[PDB]
Amino acid sequence: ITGTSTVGVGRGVLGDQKNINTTYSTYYYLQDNTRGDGIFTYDAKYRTTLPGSLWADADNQFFASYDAPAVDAHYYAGVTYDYYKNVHNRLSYDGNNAAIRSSVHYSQGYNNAFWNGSEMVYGDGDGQTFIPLSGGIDVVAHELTHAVTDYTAGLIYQNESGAINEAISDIFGTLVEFYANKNPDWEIGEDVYTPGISGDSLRSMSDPAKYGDPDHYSKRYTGTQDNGGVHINSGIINKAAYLISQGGTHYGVSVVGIGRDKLGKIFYRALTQYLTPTSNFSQLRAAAVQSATDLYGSTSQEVASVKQAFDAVGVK
Template identity: 60%
Template sequence: MLTLLGLGCMIGNFGNLVYAEQTNSGGISLEKDNSMGRIPDFKKGNLTPISDQNPEIVIFDYLNTNKESYQLGSKKAEDSFDITQITKDPVTHFTIVRLQQRYEGVPIWGYTQVAHISEQGVLKVFSGDIAPNLDQFHSLQVTRKIDETKAIEIAQKDLNMQVTYEENPTSMPYIYLQNGKPIPVYMVHLNFLDPEPGNYYYFIDVQNGNIVDKYNTINSTSVTDRKVPMVGTNTMGTGKGIWGDVKSLPITLLENKYYLQDTTRGAMIVTYDAKNRLQVPGIIWSSITNVFNQSYDAAAVDAHYYTGITYDYYKNTFNRNSYNNSGAALYSTVHYGKNYNNAFWNGSRMVYGDGDGHTFTSFSGGLDVVGHELTHAITETTSNLIYRKESGALNEAISDIFGVLIKQYQNRNIDWEPGKDISVSRNQAMRSMSNPTKYGDPDHYSKRYIGANDNGGVHTNSSIINKAAYLLANGGTHYGVTVNGIGTDKMGAIYYRANIAYFTESTNFSQARVRLIQAANDLYGGSSSEVTAVKASFDAVGIQ
């Protein structure tokens, strides 16, 4: 069986799955019940008057005016929130501001917000979970009895594995909410690829050293590739992919060698060879000719070519310049490990295994797989959806959605079955977006997985959102609800906008519904058939 490893990993083994039988209920509301009290998690309208103040002041004035509604206690908003990102919205020309909630200067894990301010200085949207009344909790008034170094030691002991770190372990103070109770913790980050990929987050109680929580994801945000781009001559080459198809490749000629380095897109696209070892980046792929036709070349040819197609899709469709919208270099490593049955994004590069040769072949041989991994990078630099439970399943679904849309962009038939092109038989996929139950995944919220495996079912429950997206694009009747399809282009535009403009780290399925409706409203108008279709698509999968 195949084993799930983390963010960007395409497949997993979930053992004895536990599924829900009940449905969620209740209509869309601007108010949200949480374990710490009822507070708004999405508000829109003219929330503030016209102002010539900068966006930060507009937001802080709004929060200070509405302290009671958000249950912020005695603290000023300026002392409770940090501005983490400011961007310009290409659709509305509003300023989009992302925030991180803090208490006494310490960030609160998973509590981020996003605000939209019009060109007239009016706050139009405020979205995201807020932890209320933190100053009422005596648990925050503690003396730290362990330090950062001890917290790392505790995490390493629990890991119980000899690893080669990709980056030095780190430990940072956070506040972690457990069942509504805030606990001061150290967040320990352990990132490694050998003996197997791991990117662990541990939350260690500062009082007693207990492990409050832990989970594994392949989402390293600080691994960097320090290789200097080769300065040579841009030229073209050709190569054969894993299925023998010939592809044109932008490459670099330097000192009588041809390298898989494309400097015509963003900063550059570079493809590396791990030589079946567990270290990355490996060495830059090269040849003495500009023809890459050897069987060992095939995985690199596909990775290089499909990364370029993925870059082109986002640039030509959304005017997005690489995953960070600032032209970041795109690195791929192929031939990772031996018979490694997976692919993942590790925070700095796409990494592809060769497959076991029985079920799957090289994972870089699927354009939808390459698009899936690079979309994880976009999510990481925008909404940064936490890779657990519903936010993690939403993260996975977004990557599946854009994987198939990128495949369609290259004028291929859209089959709605991620991973089919890397199946040895070419008739078995990892998931089905049109019929999730084909591979044992839920197609309705009432059937969702509620166990602890797979970070709370990120690869299983993603199928519920996948089905909603499929219905939104194609239409159909599901569980007695009829959806009028709006086509793949509009579906993609709505999901892209929601991810970059409205989703926050902890967005769950119900919140995603509200934010996708708002994205459709922005693009097509509040009374449009597109907004109606978004609502119906979520009705059809039982998400209210």
């Protein structure tokens, strides 16, 4: 929509108040003109046709409960954009400031969110398993990272390359959560998962097994469910990423942590320079080692830690 840039105010899924960038032209739209070619948030109106209608509001105030998921999808997409630009010098998911589009209120009681190849889509959850998915900053960043992966490595969504695709989104979803410093942790989806149960989450990067996911290559899922276990085997890579950053002793292998920032630098470089559509775990290890080498030299502690972490999870 062509109009005047302004700032509205609303309340997100968790009841928090935040300012959002909108555009005025008769109505106030969830169109952020301050980031690249824009961030656009749509109303899917409980249907499955996408993208739906660009979110229109009469007074630039978004405090209705129906508004909450829109406020968060719009706001968190902005934070994620800032992270990539500020931290990795990447302009939007395609690196050329492509417009970011998200649709909320997708279907009825839909317990998931996804990147459909063109935009992000968020369900409202059934109120038991999930509340509106856009309320979790790690969820939004995870989805947008799927876009980044699509335009870079292009990791195929099945088997090992798919598990890497998933891990990359969890890793960067987590790094964005720390970047926004929103009660950061190494868990995935804790803010929108099971409103009636405290302390749980969808996945854990620090301890994948906590939720039944493998934390070692010898325990990888070899079946066909979940596209060959893309959301299951990602636990092995998530654990490796956690070790590289924080350090620790896993299955008797000791890893000196090098911190979150370097973890982000190493994985972003691996993703954008070395990974290919069919890369497997072993190739990921090689890509990560090469990235750390480029960045810190072959005799660096950073290189040593990446090696130890992959050794720890049994990926040679």
